[PDB]
A and B are shown apart, each in its own frame.
Chain A
Amino acid sequence: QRKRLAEKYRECLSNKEKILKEIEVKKEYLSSLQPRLNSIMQASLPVQ
Protein backbone atom coordinates (compact mmCIF):
# COMPACT_ATOMS: atom_id res chain seq x y z
CA GLN A 1 0.00 0.00 0.00
CA ARG A 2 2.91 2.36 0.69
CA LYS A 3 4.45 1.47 -2.68
CA ARG A 4 1.10 2.09 -4.40
CA LEU A 5 0.79 5.44 -2.60
CA ALA A 6 4.33 6.36 -3.71
CA GLU A 7 3.45 5.38 -7.29
CA LYS A 8 0.29 7.52 -7.12
CA TYR A 9 2.34 10.42 -5.75
CA ARG A 10 4.85 9.98 -8.60
CA GLU A 11 1.98 9.95 -11.11
CA CYS A 12 0.56 13.12 -9.54
CA LEU A 13 4.00 14.75 -9.71
CA SER A 14 4.28 13.72 -13.37
CA ASN A 15 0.84 15.21 -14.05
CA LYS A 16 1.87 18.44 -12.29
CA GLU A 17 5.08 18.52 -14.35
CA LYS A 18 3.03 18.00 -17.52
CA ILE A 19 0.69 20.84 -16.51
CA LEU A 20 3.71 23.07 -15.82
CA LYS A 21 5.19 22.12 -19.20
CA GLU A 22 1.87 22.95 -20.88
CA ILE A 23 1.74 26.32 -19.10
CA GLU A 24 5.34 27.05 -20.11
CA VAL A 25 4.55 26.01 -23.70
CA LYS A 26 1.53 28.34 -23.71
CA LYS A 27 3.63 31.22 -22.33
CA GLU A 28 6.39 30.62 -24.89
CA TYR A 29 3.78 30.34 -27.65
CA LEU A 30 2.27 33.68 -26.64
CA SER A 31 5.73 35.30 -26.40
CA SER A 32 6.65 33.97 -29.84
CA LEU A 33 3.29 34.81 -31.42
CA GLN A 34 3.52 38.41 -30.18
CA PRO A 35 6.60 39.11 -32.34
CA ARG A 36 5.17 36.87 -35.06
CA LEU A 37 1.98 38.95 -35.17
CA ASN A 38 4.15 42.09 -35.16
CA SER A 39 6.11 40.80 -38.16
CA ILE A 40 2.88 39.73 -39.88
CA MET A 41 1.42 43.21 -39.37
CA GLN A 42 4.65 44.79 -40.65
CA ALA A 43 4.45 42.56 -43.74
CA SER A 44 0.75 43.34 -44.24
CA LEU A 45 1.34 47.10 -43.95
CA PRO A 46 3.76 47.05 -46.92
CA VAL A 47 1.21 45.13 -48.99
CA GLN A 48 -1.47 47.59 -47.85
Chain B
Amino acid sequence: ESVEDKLELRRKQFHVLLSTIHELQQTL
Protein backbone atom coordinates (compact mmCIF):
# COMPACT_ATOMS: atom_id res chain seq x y z
CA GLU B 1 0.00 0.00 0.00
CA SER B 2 2.92 2.35 0.71
CA VAL B 3 4.53 1.43 -2.63
CA GLU B 4 1.21 1.95 -4.42
CA ASP B 5 0.75 5.33 -2.73
CA LYS B 6 4.28 6.34 -3.77
CA LEU B 7 3.61 5.20 -7.35
CA GLU B 8 0.31 7.10 -7.39
CA LEU B 9 2.09 10.20 -6.06
CA ARG B 10 4.72 9.88 -8.80
CA ARG B 11 1.95 9.45 -11.40
CA LYS B 12 0.12 12.52 -10.08
CA GLN B 13 3.39 14.49 -10.16
CA PHE B 14 4.00 13.40 -13.77
CA HIS B 15 0.42 14.38 -14.66
CA VAL B 16 0.89 17.77 -12.98
CA LEU B 17 4.14 18.27 -14.92
CA LEU B 18 2.37 17.34 -18.17
CA SER B 19 -0.45 19.77 -17.33
CA THR B 20 2.09 22.52 -16.60
CA ILE B 21 3.82 21.80 -19.92
CA HIS B 22 0.44 21.96 -21.67
CA GLU B 23 -0.35 25.27 -19.95
CA LEU B 24 3.06 26.63 -20.99
CA GLN B 25 2.43 25.51 -24.59
CA GLN B 26 -1.02 27.11 -24.51
CA THR B 27 0.27 30.39 -23.06
CA LEU B 28 3.21 30.69 -25.47
| A37 on the B face (CB < 8 A) | yes
Q: Is the interface of B mostly helix, strand, loop or mixed?
A: helix
Inter-subunit contact A45/B21 (CB<8 Å): yes
Tally chain B residues at the interface, Cβ within 8 Å.
7
| A1 on the B face (CB < 8 A) | no
B residues with CB within 8 A of A: 14, 17-18, 21, 24-25, 28
A residues with CB within 8 A of B: 34, 37-38, 41, 44-45, 48
Offer 19 A-B interface pairs, CB within 8 angstroms, sorted by A. A34-B24, A34-B28, A37-B24, A38-B21, A38-B24, A38-B25, A38-B28, A41-B17, A41-B18, A41-B21, A41-B24, A41-B25, A44-B17, A44-B21, A45-B18, A45-B21, A48-B14, A48-B17, A48-B18
